[PDB]
Amino acid sequence: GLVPSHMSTTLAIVRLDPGLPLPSRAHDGDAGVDLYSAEDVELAPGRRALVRTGVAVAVPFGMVGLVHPRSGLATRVGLSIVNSPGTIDAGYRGEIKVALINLDPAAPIVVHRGDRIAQLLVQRVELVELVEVSSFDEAGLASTSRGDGGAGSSGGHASL
Amino acid sequence: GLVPSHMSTTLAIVRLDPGLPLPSRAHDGDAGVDLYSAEDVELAPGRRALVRTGVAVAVPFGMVGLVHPRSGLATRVGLSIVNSPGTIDAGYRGEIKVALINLDPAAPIVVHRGDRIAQLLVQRVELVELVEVSSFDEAGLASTSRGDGGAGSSGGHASL
Amino acid sequence: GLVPSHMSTTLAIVRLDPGLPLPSRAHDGDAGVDLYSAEDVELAPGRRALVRTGVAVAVPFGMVGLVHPRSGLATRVGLSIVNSPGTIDAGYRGEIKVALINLDPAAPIVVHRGDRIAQLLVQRVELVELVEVSSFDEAGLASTSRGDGGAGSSGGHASL
Ligand SMILES: O=c1ccn([C@H]2C[C@H](O)[C@@H](COP(=O)(O)NP(=O)(O)OP(=O)(O)O)O2)c(=O)[nH]1
Ligand SMILES: O=c1ccn([C@H]2C[C@H](O)[C@@H](COP(=O)(O)NP(=O)(O)OP(=O)(O)O)O2)c(=O)[nH]1
Ligand SMILES: O=c1ccn([C@H]2C[C@H](O)[C@@H](COP(=O)(O)NP(=O)(O)OP(=O)(O)O)O2)c(=O)[nH]1
Ligand SMILES: [Mg+2]
Ligand SMILES: [Mg+2]
Ligand SMILES: [Mg+2]
């Protein structure tokens, strides 16, 4: 019960499905807590599903919850998340749902209730105030090394 | 006009396409502002497109802009973003472009100019200074619970 | 050698493959350092591979490493990362591996050893303490504008 971690943050969670464990970090230091599937789902190759996790959270104002795929499933069976990283807003009070998708070309993926199918990170976010300018120069911003370079401008692959 | 939010950050934006609304948060607290498509795009199943948003921003030095898919489109029509999360560097002064892709196997996705097709988050990032070491032990780092465990090492699915 | 950047963070790195350059930022201010492939890989359409980068890092406790696709490859050849954003935990001391996938329907992607195939960001993360509540109301949280709205509730596309 002693906070060693004084400024570590408290995430209210409702287990909409009390049958599932509370999400937890696999190892100390891990960035996310793993989310369970509340249901059994089979995804044929290329199919997607919106899977309930059985939890609702209250991400603090000034923060964001981020739903990330797990790496093992991604490589072993081609499981991904369509909208990755899923963006859980501070005001959301609904059930977190995971948009799983099977990116394997031939093997279906079976998800069982109680499987760990994603991980939830919480991070700060900047709640930005847009300042519309006619040009960056007019806003007095110094030019930058990057400039308008994008889309592979730095090279690093034959196709770029 | 009164800043209630004293340390909230200001994002210079140029509407390269003045016909589109400024990106905005759907709800108070939302992590991102939605980006519009400046153009009409149809994506057949499996096709991708680099779609202009009509905006350029100046992400502050020490921050990153992150282009995330919207969840509704992801589930309803299989819209995703190839390079999600798109990484907008602080020095970039070009147009934000969104690499949309249709991950549905059969139904095309029609995007109209003025549709909200992604969301932009701004977060701090650590501008890391690499310190090359011959080993972590030699750097005097304590071993960790995780160690070299990865790629599903904690289990949580039959395939792992 | 003078720190202009006083509070900028130090990332221990082991070049497991000393033949590859240390990851670097393409431009000042860039959010990530580019990761190299340590190996030659060809991905037929729809195939994925777990590619070694030749590096191990020690992400600081209270932080996360994030493996993001590069935008140029994503658009030019449909390269993506299955588990994007890859989540490198602070305790991980193994090799960073990148789950590349070819989302192009017809053209294979050839990766050569020494190509820059992803970028690594480091960010703070909140190591959340879950507080289970029976309801948010019972936790005394004010209702929110968003409520349980999700999954396209704000509209912005014909399909929503
Ligand atoms: O979704 C995105 C991602 C990047 N961008 C722009 C801004 C970013 O600063 C720039 C480079 O992004 P990446 O580093 O992710 N791509 P890549 O490494 O291919 O390009 P470069 O070689 O220019 O760094 O491309 C977009 O417009 N949309
Ligand atoms: O892109 C990635 C993602 C993860 N990793 C390594 C470092 C990370 O700490 C570790 C576990 O990542 P995930 O938690 O995302 N995967 P999973 O939950 O399957 O593995 P584990 O059960 O070990 O947590 O795998 C990579 O090398 N590359
Ligand atoms: O992976 C996700 C992403 C979002 N969500 C919920 C919480 C988030 O606050 C809400 C809206 O997320 P998006 O803004 O990414 N989606 P979209 O813009 O389609 O919905 P809305 O129009 O409600 O903002 O949907 C999930 O349950 N899982
Ligand atoms: Mg894990
Ligand atoms: Mg939204
Ligand atoms: Mg780059």
Side-chain angles (χ1 to χ4, degrees), chain A residues 146 150-154, chain B residues 83 86-89 92 97, chain C residues 70-72 119:
Chain A
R146 172 166 284 282
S153 77
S154 72
Chain B
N83 60 328
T87 306
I88 313 303
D89 301 295
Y92 186 61
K97 294 174 194 191
Chain C
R70 295 180 66 203
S71 77
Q119 59 200 308

Side-chain angles (χ1 to χ4, degrees), chain A residues 146-156 160, chain B residues 50-51 53 55 65-68 81 83-99, chain C residues 25-27 30-32 34 68-75 116 118-119:
Chain A
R146 172 166 284 282
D148 61 5
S153 77
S154 72
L160 303 172
Chain B
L50 184 66
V51 184
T53 64
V55 301
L66 296 159
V67 178
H68 292 187
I81 297 174
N83 60 328
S84 188
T87 306
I88 313 303
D89 301 295
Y92 186 61
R93 298 288 178 271
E95 186 167 13
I96 294 178
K97 294 174 194 191
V98 181
Chain C
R25 305 177 254 307
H27 290 273
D30 276 3
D34 289 355
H68 292 187
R70 295 180 66 203
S71 77
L73 290 164
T75 173
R116 281 176 288 117
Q119 59 200 308

Side-chain angles (χ1 to χ4, degrees), chain A residues 27 48 70 82 84 126 128 144 147, chain B residues 9 25 80 84 91 104 145 155:
Chain A
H27 290 273
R48 69 186 181 274
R70 295 180 66 203
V82 184
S84 188
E126 302 291 331
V128 338
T144 67
Chain B
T9 104
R25 305 177 254 307
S80 189
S84 188
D104 193 77
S145 165

